[PDB]
Amino acid sequence: MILTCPECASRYFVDDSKVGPDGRVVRCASCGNRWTAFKDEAELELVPR
Ligand SMILES: [Zn+2]
């Protein structure tokens, strides 16, 4: 999965295990900013995986 920094305005990637449907906090590698992230890669119903 990938997330965008509110400050760097740039994308950064992490494993899908780093976030769940309940959400999880993350940290920027470029400015140390922090915010809550959420999953969408498998949030849909009847998902095959
Ligand atoms: Zn940043």
Side-chain angles (χ1 to χ4, degrees):
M1 63 190 297
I2 210 163
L3 297 169
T4 325
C5 181
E7 302 295 347
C8 300
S10 187
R11 298 188 181 276
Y12 168 87
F13 43 86
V14 304
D15 294 355
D16 294 356
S17 298
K18 302 300 184 180
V19 188
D22 192 21
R24 183 62 177 227
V25 72
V26 315
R27 180 177 66 250
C28 187
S30 291
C31 72
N33 188 30
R34 306 180 185 216
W35 64 91
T36 325
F38 284 83
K39 175 164 291 182
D40 187 26
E41 288 79 8
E43 176 63 6
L44 304 177
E45 63 182 356
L46 281 68
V47 71
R49 176 59 60 227

